[PDB]
């Protein structure tokens, strides 16, 4: 009901967020009754916007549809509505405006980059009445949302999945944009060396082992505190080795305990056999002796009779004794025939197995766009608590539709590469050049800069962008500490659909471990006959130094040895992403590197406040603001996270220069 809207906005329906504590200190510290009133007004306003995000939810309309005792306090309602709208929880994206834009504007903001985070801020700021200009190095909007288009071919080289609509702000964007969303059939065959579908029985043992191995590292981390080793911090990959090794050690340990109890039994038998030989020997004599004593025929005295009767008793004693020893020798003889037939597993994982496991690892390198040797063991999964609900979707018609949509109405300067950012007590100048002719230079002066430069660009060892004054250590160190990963695609365009049209994805299992990322996964998502080949893990970095033709070579091979050397045409069109080489990206997206933590994401997001111009003038206003995928702790490395960070900075900038 109303409680569903809170969930769709990533908010608890039943308590107040620490954000809200900050703007409604009255409420949070007050009567629990009013808190419930607040929460209901909040939840109901959210519901109203969410139920029709195609048009602006004015304060009028909100109080109108408020019922019961709640439209009683109209100042409280106007408060809640404004809070929601400043922070971008309602009237965000592309809506029809009701109250039209301010005639005269207030403040000026330069936004660096028109990726989704830049664009989202730009729209918010513009709807708050500010003057917004975006500077974009590329000749297109969208940044790392990059759709390839030619004829009817269409293929995302950047973001391509909406990872669930439950609580995803792109839920709202897709209601607002012609966004053609398609469920992903989440079954995926695996094809090996010479080209053989992996038996389903196998696929599932390895997958189950993969997952068991992950939980193992989590226990290895949280329970045993296996987090520092040799003064460096432990990576996920390190911990995976250590877990795998310990499983091999335990396999050997069991073979030892087994054969070691075969030998204990073999030595028990031996001890018995000996008693039994030295009874056969002892009995042999007793026979001879009894036989000789029987040679003395029975006209015989009593000592001679005692020696016949004695040797006889003696002889049948040693005879029972040896018979019980030869039943004990039969119980032993079979206990040992069983152990010889109950041998623990010969291996932990076979070679065929460990290469299928290596594909499940490449799948994990692909999601986190980086080698598992770089991910923090302790923190690599720290955003997992915040997963959306529902199926994962692809954008059938190209994700670029979203940026292009957001860009409508905005002042976007393309082919403008920012070079230096200057921020002072009085304001800022951004210096940019024309990417076509390097020499043509531009000076933009503004009240505030929103930096949405990719983490990979901010990381560039010889700076691609100079900050004046330089960013403080707390910010640069966060920048050095987290990872910016990599992940590339091959797009294959054909005349005839020759794959199985009912399968969305399917795998290729690498020969070696090193090459587990190399073209390990294939996507069929689009109308046209298009196939996408991912290059994940350590392959991505390397495959970029290989010509386009070789890459598509290796590609058509893999497909031929899977579909038949004859069903596989040449491709009409090929593209090969190279994100690490792209100078407006320098990689694909961020990842919590070993030694980092989601705390660095928050450091990324703190605004910078220049010092006073005149000595002893009061401490200024903050002037440099950061948004972007790498600035949002709970949703890094996604589009919704970019968008959220844009909405965040917009509200914060407006709170600063227009007051709250």
């Amino acid at each position: 009901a109303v409680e569903g809207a809170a969930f769709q906005s990533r908010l608890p329906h039943d308590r107040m967020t620490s954000q809200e504590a900050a703007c409604f200190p009255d409420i949070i510290s007050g009567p629990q009754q009013t808190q419930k009133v607040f929460l209901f007004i909040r939840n109901r306003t959210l519901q109203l916007w969410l139920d029709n995000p195609k048009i602006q939810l004015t304060f009028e309309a909100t109080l109108q549809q408020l019922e019961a005792p709640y439209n009683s306090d109209t100042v409280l309602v106007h408060r809640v509505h404004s809070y929601l709208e400043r922070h971008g929880l309602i009237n965000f994206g592309i809506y029809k405006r009701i109250k039209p834009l301010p005639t005269k504007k207030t403040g000026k903001v330069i936004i660096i980059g028109s990726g989704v985070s830049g664009l989202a801020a730009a729209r918010q700021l513009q709807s708050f009445g500010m003057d917004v200009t975006l500077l974009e190095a590329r000749d297109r909007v969208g940044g790392r949302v990059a759709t390839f288009r030619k004829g009817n071919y269409v293929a995302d080289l950047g973001a391509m999945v909406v990872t669930g609509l439950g609580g995803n702000p792109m839920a709202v964007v897709s209601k607002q944009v012609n966004m053609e969303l398609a469920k992903i059939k989440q079954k995926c065959p695996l094809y090996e060396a010479n080209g053989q579908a992996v038996p389903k029985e196998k696929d599932e043992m390895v997958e189950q082992e993969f997952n068991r191995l992950l939980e193992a590292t989590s226990y290895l981390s949280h329970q045993l505190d296996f987090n520092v080793l040799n003064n460096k911090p432990v990576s996920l990959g390190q911990a995976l080795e250590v877990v795998i090794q310990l499983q091999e050690k335990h396999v050997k340990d069991e073979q030892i305990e087994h054969w070691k109890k075969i030998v204990k039994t073999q030595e028990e038998l031996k001890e018995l056999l000996n008693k039994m030989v030295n009874l056969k020997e002892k009995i042999k004599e007793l026979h001879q002796q009894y036989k000789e004593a029987s040679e003395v025929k029975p006209p015989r005295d009593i000592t001679a009779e005692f020696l016949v009767k004695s040797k006889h008793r003696d002889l049948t004693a040693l005879c029972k004794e040896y018979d019980e020893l030869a039943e004990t020798q039969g119980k032993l003889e079979e206990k040992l025939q069983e152990l010889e037939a109950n041998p623990p597993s010969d291996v932990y994982l076979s070679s065929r197995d460990r290469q299928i496991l290596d594909w499940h690892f490449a799948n994990l390198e692909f999601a986190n766009a980086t080698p598992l040797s770089t991910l923090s063991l302790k923190h690599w999964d720290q955003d997992d608590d915040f997963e959306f609900t529902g199926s994962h979707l692809t954008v059938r018609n190209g994700y670029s539709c979203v940026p292009v949509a957001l860009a409508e109405g905005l002042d976007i300067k393309l082919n403008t590469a920012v070079r230096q950012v200057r921020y002072t007590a009085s304001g800022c100048e951004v210096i940019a050049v024309n990417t076509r002719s390097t020499s043509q230079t531009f000076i933009y002066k503004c009240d505030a800069v929103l930096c949405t430069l990719p983490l990979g660009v901010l990381k560039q060892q010889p700076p691609a962008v100079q900050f004046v004054p330089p960013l403080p250590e707390w910010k640069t160190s966060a920048v050095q500490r987290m990872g910016f990963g990599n992940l590339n695609k091959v797009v294959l365009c054909f005349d005839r659909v020759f794959w199985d049209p009912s399968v969305n994805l399917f795998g290729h299992v690498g020969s070696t471990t090193a090459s587990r990322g190399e073209l390990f996964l294939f996507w069929n998502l689009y109308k046209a006959p298009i196939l996408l080949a991912l290059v994940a893990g350590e392959a991505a970095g390397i495959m970029e130094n290989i010509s386009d033709d070789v890459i598509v070579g290796r590609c058509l091979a893999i497909l031929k040895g899977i579909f038949g050397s004859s069903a596989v045409p040449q491709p009409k069109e090929t593209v090969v992403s190279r994100w690490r080489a792209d100078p407006w990206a320098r990689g694909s997206y961020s990842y919590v590197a070993a030694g980092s933590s989601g705390n660095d994401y928050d450091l990324m997001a703190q605004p910078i406040t220049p010092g006073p111009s005149i000595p002893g003038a009061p401490q200024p206003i903050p002037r440099l603001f950061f948004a972007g995928e790498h600035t949002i702790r709970n949703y890094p490395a996604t589009v919704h996270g970019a968008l959220l960070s844009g909405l965040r900075e917009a509200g914060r900038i407006a709170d600063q220069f227009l007051g709250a």
Binding site: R212, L213, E215, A216, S218, Y219, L220, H222, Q223, L224, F226, L229, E241, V242, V243, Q245, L246, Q247, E248, K249, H250, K252, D253, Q255, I256, W259, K260, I262, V263, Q266, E267, L269, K270, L273, N274, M276, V277, L279, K280, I283, K284, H287, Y290, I302, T303, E305, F306, K309, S310, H312, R313, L315, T316, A317, C319, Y322, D323, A326
Partner: protein, 134 residues
Amino acid sequence: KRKPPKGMFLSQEDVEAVSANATAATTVLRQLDMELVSVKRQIQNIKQTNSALKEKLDGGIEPYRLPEVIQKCNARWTTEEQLLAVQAIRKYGRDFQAISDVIGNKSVVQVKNFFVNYRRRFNIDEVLQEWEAE
């Protein structure tokens, strides 16, 4: 967290063991590899030896057993049976089971009986101290 997945093994102990240096891993694994071959070949050995001992038993104890009649237990001590007795007491001491098996028609009952009925004129005390000399 909590306790490791079921069937993974991750003792504290082990982890320092495979981490404390760079090849401490493929060492602890190689030394177990060998302690295996070691124990396997010492099974090959006790098998060869047990196989030989088995040859020396071929025949069992078959041409060596003697039937053990019946002798329905009586109760009169014939002069023969007393003389067997006193000789069994010198060969066996108190193994009243063997002593009854030698005599044949006396059971551990009268064997214990006799021991004190005749204890005097068969100088049974002296006889037993002879067996104790052992």
